[PDB]
Amino acid sequence: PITGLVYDQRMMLHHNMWDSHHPELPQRISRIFSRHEELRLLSRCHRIPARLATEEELALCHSSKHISIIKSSEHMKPRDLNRLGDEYNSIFISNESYTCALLAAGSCFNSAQAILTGQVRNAVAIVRPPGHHAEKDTACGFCFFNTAALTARYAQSITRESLRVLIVDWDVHHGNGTQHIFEEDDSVLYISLHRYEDGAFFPNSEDANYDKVGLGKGRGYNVNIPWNGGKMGDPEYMAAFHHLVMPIAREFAPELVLVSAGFDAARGDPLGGFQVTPEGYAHLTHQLMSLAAGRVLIILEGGYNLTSISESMSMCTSMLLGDSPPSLDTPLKTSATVSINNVLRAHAPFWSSL
In the complex, which residues of this chain contact ligand QI8 (CB under 6 A)? 90, 130, 133, 141-142, 171, 173, 202, 262, 264, 271, 301-302
8 makes contact, choosing from Zn ion, K ion, ligand QI8, none, with CB < 5 to 8 Å by partner type, with none
* Helix, strand, coil percentages, rounded to 5, for the chain: 45, 15, 45
Q: Which of residues 13-42 bind K ion (CB under 5 A)?
A: none
Q: Is the dihedral of CA 289, 293, 294, 297 positive or negative?
A: negative
Max Cα separation, the chain? 55
In the list 96, 171, 236, 255, the residue contacting K ion (rule: CB under 5 A) is 171
Residue 252 contact among ligand QI8, Zn ion, K ion, none, beta carbon within 5 to 8 Å by kind: none
Strands 296-300 and 256-261, by their bridges, are: parallel
Q: Which is nearer to ligand QI8, 129 or 230 (CB)?
A: 129
Of 7, 182, 202, 227, the residue at the interface with K ion (CB under 5 A) is 182
Crossing angle (nearest 10°) for helices 27-38 and 306-320: 50
> Closest Cα partner for 151 from 256, 264, 24, 293?
256
CB of 211 to ligand QI8, least distance (A): 22
Q: Count CA atoms within 13 Å of residue 168 on its CB side.
A: 26
Q: Among ligand QI8, K ion, Zn ion, none, what does residue 164 contact (CB within 5–8 Å per kind)? A: none
253: region left, alpha or beta (phi > 0 left; psi from -120 to 50 alpha):
left
Which of 201, 254, 249 has its CA nearest to residue 223? 249
Please identify, using beta-carbon distances, which residue of 171 and 255 lies nearer to Zn ion. 171
- Does residue 264 have a known ligand-binding role? yes
How many Å apart are CA 292 and CA 108, to the nearest integer? 18
Based on CB atoms, which residue is closest to Zn ion, 173 or 212? 173
Q: Toward K ion, which CB reaches closer, 7 or 182? A: 182
Sign of torsion, CA 320 149 226 87?
A: positive
In the list 57, 185, 234, 255, the residue contacting K ion (rule: CB under 5 A) is 185
Q: How far is the CB of 277 from Zn ion (least distance, A)?
A: 17
Q: Helix (H, G, I), strand (E, B), or coil: what is residue 224?
A: strand
Q: Which of 15, 36, 62, 133 is catalytic?
A: 133
CB of 173 to ligand QI8, least distance (A): 4
Name, in order, each residue with C-beta under 8 angstroms of 249's C-beta and a sequence gap of 6 or more: 166, 168, 189, 191, 257, 288, 291
Residue among 30, 73, 107, 192 that touches K ion (CB under 5 A): 192
Q: Which does 185 bind (CB under 5 to 8 A by kind): ligand QI8, K ion, Zn ion, none?
A: K ion
Residue 242: active-site member: no
Length of the chain, please?
354
In the complex with ligand QI8, the residue whose CB is nearer, 3 or 146, is 146
Please give the residue whose beta carbon sits closest to ligand QI8 in the complex.
141
Least distance in Å: CB of 333 to ligand QI8?
21
198 annotated as a binding-site residue: no
* N- to C-terminal Cα separation, the chain: 33
Among positions 287-306, residues that touch Zn ion (CB under 5 A) are 302
Query: Residue 262 interacts with Zn ion (CB under 5 A)?
Result: yes
- 186 belongs to an annotated ligand binding site: no
Query: Does residue 249 contact residue 191 with C-beta atoms inside 8 Å?
Result: yes
Query: Of residues 169, 234, 255, 264, which one binds K ion by CB under 5 A?
Result: 169
State how far the Cα of 126 lies from the Cα of 113, in Å rounded to an integer. Answer: 16
Give the separation between CA 178 and CA 9, rounded to whole angstroms. Answer: 26
Residues annotated as catalytic (active site), given as ranges? 133
Q: Under the rule (CB under 5 A), what is the footprint of Zn ion?
A: 171, 173, 262, 264, 302
Q: Under the rule (CB under 5 A), what is the footprint of K ion?
A: 169, 171, 182, 185, 190, 192, 194, 218, 221-222
| Feature table: binding site for Zn(2+) | 171, 173, 264
